[PDB]
Amino acid sequence: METLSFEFPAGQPGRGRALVGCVGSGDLEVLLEPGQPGKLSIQVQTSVNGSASRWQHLFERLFDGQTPPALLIDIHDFGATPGVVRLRLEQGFEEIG
Amino acid sequence: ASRGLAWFQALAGSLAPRPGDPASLRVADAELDGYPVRFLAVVPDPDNPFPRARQGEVGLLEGWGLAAAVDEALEADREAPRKRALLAIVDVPSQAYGRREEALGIHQALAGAVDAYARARLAGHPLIGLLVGKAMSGAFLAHGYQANRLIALHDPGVMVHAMGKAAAARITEALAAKVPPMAYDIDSYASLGLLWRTLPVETVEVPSTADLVRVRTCLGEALADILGGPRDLGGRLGAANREASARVRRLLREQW
Amino acid sequence: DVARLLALRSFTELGARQRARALLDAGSFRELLDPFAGVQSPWLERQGIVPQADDGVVVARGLLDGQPAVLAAIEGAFQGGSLGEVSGAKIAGALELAAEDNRNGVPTRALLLLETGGVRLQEANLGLAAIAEIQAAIVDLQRYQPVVAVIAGPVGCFGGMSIAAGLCSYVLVTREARLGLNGPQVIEQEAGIAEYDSRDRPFIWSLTGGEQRFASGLADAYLADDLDEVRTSVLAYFAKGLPARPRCRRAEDYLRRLGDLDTAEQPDAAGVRRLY
Amino acid sequence: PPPQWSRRRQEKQRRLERVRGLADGAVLPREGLVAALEALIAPGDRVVLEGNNQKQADFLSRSLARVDPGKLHDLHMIMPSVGRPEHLDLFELGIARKLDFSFSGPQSLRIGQLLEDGLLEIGAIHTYIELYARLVVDLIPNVALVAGFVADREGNVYTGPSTEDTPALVEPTAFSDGIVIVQVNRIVDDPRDLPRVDIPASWVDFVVEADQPFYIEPLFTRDPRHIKPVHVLMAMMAIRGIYQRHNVQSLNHGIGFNTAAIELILPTYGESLGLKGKICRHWTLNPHPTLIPAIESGWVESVHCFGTELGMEGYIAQRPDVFFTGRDGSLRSNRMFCQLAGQYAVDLFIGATLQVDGDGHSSTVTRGRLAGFGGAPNMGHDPRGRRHSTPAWLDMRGEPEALLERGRKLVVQMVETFQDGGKPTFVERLDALEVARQTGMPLAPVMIYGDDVTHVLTEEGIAYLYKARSLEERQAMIAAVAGISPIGLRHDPRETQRMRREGLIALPEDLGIRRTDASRELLAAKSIAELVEWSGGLYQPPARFRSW
C-alpha cells in the first residue's frame, strides 16, 4: 500500500460535497469536498504499489485543458482498473455540480 | 486606467508605447522561460485621433496597428530558429461605434488584425490570449480570439460576449443564466470548452507578486502545450455544450 | 423596351438556397446537412423560438467552372441571418474542409453569400466563437485559393461577419449591399443621434452602401442586381486566383492615410473616396 | 474387398474380438470398462476424448486415467476442450504423450508445466472447426470416447441439448474403421423410449451406462451480479457505435462479461434507441442465460446453438420458434454447424481478450499459460471465401461503387484498457512471442490478428480500424483508445479531435452517450434470480449459481 499526493491548477471552489464508490476489491471510493481557490488537492491511498505515475497520467488526462473546480479529493483504492477509476472520478465531479 | 494596461506593465515591465504605434497599443518583446515573446495589449488612449475610440475601444487605428505589429514579428522571425510567442493581453470593452469608423471601414481594419494574427499562428507562432477583463464582440475577434490557447483570470470583471449587458437588456435581467451561450460570467463561458485554463488571482487590478508567479507559470505551460502540436483551433471543440459544433464537422466530412 | 423590364432576373429576389443553386454550375448543386438532416439549433426551442431545420445557412458542394467548390449562403429571412452555433459551424467546417482538400491536391474554392446581421443573441457566445473559426478558416484556405464573398442585400453584411468579409480575397457587391461593422441603430444609441441617424437611409447607404465601398476600394467589384452578371463576376474572380496584394496586408498604407486625415470634422462619402 | 486394401477393417476386427467375451453385443459392462479400454485402444492411438466446451465424457475420461501405462502409452489425444484434471493426468501418468486441442481454461498453467517437463507435446492449438476438419485429412482418429444421455441396446444414441461436438467427432472415426465408445446416462430396453436419434447405431461400436450422469460445464453462463458500470459503458458503445452504426442483423458474442452486458441492456438501452427488430435478429450463440431478457422482450428472432448451458434446457423447449428443436421437443445443438454459421453466415463477431499489442494482434496466451483459442479464430477473422452480401458486410467498403472491392465481416475486440489484476491490456509485445520461443512453436500463438480487426472497443471509445489505410494509421487509432496503457501513452492527445472529426475514432460523446449514464440500472436483469424470473421459472441455474 502507498499514499500519494497530487496537486493541480483549479478554478473557484466547488460548493457541494460528494461520496462515490466503495473500498471493495477492484473498486475505490472517492470523497469530494470544496477546496482552496486555484488549487485541486488529491490524496490517494491504494493497495497497488508503484502506481504513482499511472495515477499521474490518469489525472493529467482528466484535467487536460479543462479547469476543474477547486476541490479536496480523497481516494481510497483497492485495485480498481484505470477505467473504473476514471469513471468514478467523473461520477464524483458530476454530483458535486 | 485599464486592467489591460496594468497587466501589460506587470508582465512586460515596459510601459511607454513604441514610437510608430498608435497610443492605444502597447507592444514589447521579451522572453518567457527563455522563449522569445511579444506582448500585445489594446488600452485606452483619451487623445485618440478618433473621438469615438477614446475609452479603450478597438477602432480604426487599433485594428490596423495590431495588424502592423503582428506582421512585424511575423516577418522578423521568418527564418529565426524559433517563431516568437504572441501574448495578447485582452481587455477591450468593445468595437468603436461611430461615423468615421463606418465611413472609413472599421470592419476592414479589424480584419487586418485578425488576418495578421491567424497568419502568425499558421506560420508556427504560438498565440496565447490572456483575458484580464472585457473581451467583447469584434474587439475580441480582432484582438485575442485567434489564439491557440485562451486563458482567463477567474474574476467577475472578466467577461466574454457579443454585446454589452445594457444593450442586451435594452433589446429585451440576467435570465441568461439559464442558457450558457447567453451568460456573461466566465464560468458559463468556460463551460463552452473554449478556455484552456482559468486562474483566480489575489488582486486583479494590480497583480500581486504571487499572482505574477502563477500567471507566468501558466503562460509557460500554455506555450509548452502549443509547441510541436496542431496549429489550428480544434482544441476548442471538446465540451458537451459545444456538442453540435463537433457533430456538424463530423457530418460535413461524412458527406463531403 | 417593356420586354426587357418584364424579363428582369434579380439576384436579390432569390432566397439563399436559390442563390446557391443558381451560382454553382448547372447540375452540380449538392447540399450538405440539408433540412431533412434535421440539424437545427439546440438552443432556440427552450427559449420559445421556432427553429429552422438548416439553421438558416445553406452549405452546398458543386462546381464553379468545372472546378471543385463549396458554397455557404446565409438565409437573411431567418433570425435576420444572425449566426448561431450550428449555422456558424456549418460555414466554418466547410471552409476547414476546403483548406484540407487543397493540402491533398484538390483545389477546392469557397464562395460565401453573406446576408447577415452578425451574431445571434440567444446563442451569443457560440455565434461569436464560430465566427472566430470562420475567420481562421478563411485565412487558412486563402493560402491556396481565394475566397469570394458576395454581398447583395437586402440585409447586407454586418457585425462579426463584416470582419470575415474583410478577410476575403475578393468582395463583390451590389448597390443594395451594405457592408459595415455596427448596424445604424446601435451606433445611434451608443454615440447619439448626432453621430449617426438610423432613420436616414440615404445617409447610411452613402457611407456603407455597395457603391461607396467599391468606389473607396473597400470592395473589388460593383455588380448589377442580376443573376447572370453575378455568376459571371464570381467565375472571373476565382479564375484570377489569389490577389498579389490584398486589402488585409496593407496596414501600413491604411495607417498612413488615416494619419493624414483631419479627424476634427466628420468625413463624408466624397472625403473617404479622396482619402483612399 | 482385397486384404492389402482392408488392413484398417482387419485391425478393427481383431480389437473387437478381444472384448467379445467381455461385452454383451454393443453394451459394455461398467465393471470391465478399464479392461475394455486396454483391449480396444492400442499404444500410439489417436484418441478423440470429449472435452467439449460443456459436455464431458468424464466416466470414460476417469476410466482411461486408471489404465495400465505399460499397456497404453504414447496416446495422441485430440480434444476440443482440455478442462478436466483427468485429461492432463493422462500425460503425467505416462498414458498420453501428444495433444492437439482448441480450448483450455483452468489447466492453462498445468499444460505449460507438463510441456516443460516433457510429459506433454503440443501438436497445435486450433479453433474447434479447424480441429474437426483435420479428422478426415491429417488426424484421422483411431478411437472416439464420447457421451450421450440415452442409448438403446443396439447403439442408437440420444444426445439432445448436449449434442455439441459429438457428430463431428464420431463421423470421421466411425467411417474410417475406427472405434466409437459412447457413455450414456441410461440404456433403455425399449428402443422406442429413445427420445430421438442423434448418432445412429451404425456409427457406434459400444455403449456403456455411466457410473453417474456425464459432467456438464456451464461454460458461457455469466452471473449478472459481476457486471460493473465500465462493462455497461462499453456495451452501450457497442450497440450504438457498432450494431446500429453498421446495421448489424446477425452475430456471435464471444464468451464473457463484456458481451453479457450487451445482451442485458438491449431491452433497456437498445429499446431507448428504438432498435428492437432493427438489429441483432439472428444469433449463432450458446443459449446464454443472459440472453433471456432479450428473447422475452422480442429482440431475438432465431438462435442456433453450438452447445447448451446447463439449466437452460427446459426454457429452450418452451421457445421452439426461436431455437432449433427436434420432434421430442428438446434443443439440437451442433458445434460444427454453428461454428460454420458463425464464420460464413453472420455479420459480426465481438469478443474480449487478455492482451492486445500496438498492431492489434490479440491473444489469451500469457506467460506460462497456454490458453487455447477456442472459437475466437474461426469467428474473429474476415472469411475470404464468403461471397453473399449483407448490408453490414457491405458497409465496410471504402468505395461502395468499386465493383471489385469486397465486403468484410465485422470483427470487434471489446476489452478494458487494463485487466483486473493491474496489468495493462495493450502492450508493446504480446506474451505470446516469448511463449513461442520457450515452447518451440514456429509462430506466436495469436488468437486474432490485428489485420482482421475492424473495431477496437474500449471504455475510452471505439477505434474504427477498418478505415485504416496503412499499418501506421491503424497503430495511431489503437493508441487513441488504449488509455494510459503503454500503447495508449504513445498517443498525443492533441490528435484526438482530428481523429474524432474524421470518424477514425468515436468517443462516447460522439455517440450521444454520457459516460456517467453507464450503470447497473440499465441491466434488464441484475442477478441469476432475476434471470430465472424473466424465464418464468423455466431456467434452472446449476448449483454454482444458486442462492436458494
Numbering used by the authors:
A (entry chain C): 1 to 97
B (entry chain E): 6 to 177, 185 to 268
C (entry chain D): 3 to 278
D (entry chain A): 7 to 554
Kindly provide excerpts from the paper associated with this entry.
Pseudomonas species and other aerobic bacteria have a biotin-independent malonate decarboxylase that is crucial for their utilization of malonate as the sole carbon and energy source. The malonyl-ACP is decarboxylated in the second step of the reaction to regenerate acetyl-ACP, which is catalyzed by MdcD (30 kD) and MdcE (28 kD).
The hybrid hetero-tetramer with the P. fluorescens MdcC, which has 76% identity with P. aeruginosa MdcC, produced much better crystals. MdcC did not carry the prosthetic group, as we were not able to express the modifying enzymes in E. coli. A malonate molecule from the crystallization solution is bound in the MdcA active site (see below), so this structure is actually the complex with malonate. The current atomic model has good agreement with the crystallographic data and the expected bond lengths, bond angles and other geometric parameters. The four copies of the hetero-tetramers in the asymmetric unit have similar conformation, with overall rms distances of 0.2–0.4 Å between any pair of their equivalent Cα atoms. The structure therefore indicates that MdcC is an important bridging subunit, mediating the formation of the hetero-tetramer, while the contact between MdcA and MdcD–MdcE (400 Å2) is likely too small to form a stable sub-complex. The active site of MdcA is located at the interface between its AN and AC domains. One of the carboxylates (C1) of malonate has bidentate ion-pair interactions with Arg341, and its two oxygens are also hydrogen-bonded to the side chains of Asn292 and Gln345, respectively.
